Amino acid sequence: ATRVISAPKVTKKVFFKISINGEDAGTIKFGLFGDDVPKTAENFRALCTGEKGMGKLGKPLHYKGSPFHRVIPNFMIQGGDITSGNGYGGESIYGSKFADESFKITHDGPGLLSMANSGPNTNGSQFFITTVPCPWLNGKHVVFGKVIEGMEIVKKIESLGSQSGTPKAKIIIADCGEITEL
């Protein structure tokens, strides 16, 4: 026992490489709460690596190339639309939208990964990262990870958003994958 954590255990690590209008913006690192929400964390991890290949909607189950389509200053940045890329698409690794796995982990602070949805049990590939505490989202959105490195880049992406959410630059997951070197 090494740390005395006030927070869920990080059981898997993954990353995004961010491009803004074609230019590199750096890397964001995430750790996922695999012991708490293992089905949601596995979905996000396989979408990072792309290992499941082609989804039923005719585009890769891979976050690579997907944009951040809604960036709302002092709220959150939202991406993960891997089918149509317009903010209405997406697809999980489970051949269908899957159910809310747990609501125990709450949106207490900036930096948390959580799933976007359109109702109960409609999780897909779309996710969002908090930049403020969002306790009104508790019970509606499954939290399943957190930024562990590169929050400065999250903030950079934030600073490009609007009150409407339409961002002021094309913000792209240039590359992504699982951190496998320890």
Author numbering: 6 to 187
Quoted from the paper:
As compared with TvCyp1, TvCyP2, containing an extra segment at the N-terminus (N-terminal segment), as shown in Figure 1A,B, is found primarily in the endoplasmic reticulum (ER) and regulates protein trafficking of TvCyP1 and Myb3 toward hydrogenosomes and also TvCyP1 toward the plasma membrane. With the SEC-MALS experiment, the molecular weight of TvCyP2 was measured at ~20.01 kDa in a solution similar to theoretical molecular weight 20.947 kDa, TvCyP2 forms a monomer, which agrees well with most of the single-domain CyPs but not TvCyP1.
Using the ARI crystallization robot, we performed crystal screenings of TvCyP2 under various conditions and found that four needle-shaped crystals gave good X-ray diffraction data, all belonging to the space group p2(1)2(1)2(1). In all four crystal structures, except for forming a typical canonical cyclophilin fold, the N-terminal segment contacted the active site of a neighboring molecule. A detailed analysis showed that these interactions include H-bonds formed by the N-terminal T7, R8, I10, and S11 with active site W141, R75, Q83, and N122 residues, respectively, and also by N-terminal S11 with Q131 of the S2 pocket. In addition, some hydrophobic contacts were observed: N-terminal A6 with active site F80, N-terminal V9 with active site M81, A121, F133, L142, and H146, and N-terminal P13 with S2 pocket Y93. In comparing the hCyPA–CsA complex structure, the corresponding active-site residues in hCyPA, R55, Q63, N102, and W121 form H-bonds with CsA, and F60, M61, A103, F113, L122, and H126 have hydrophobic contacts with CsA.
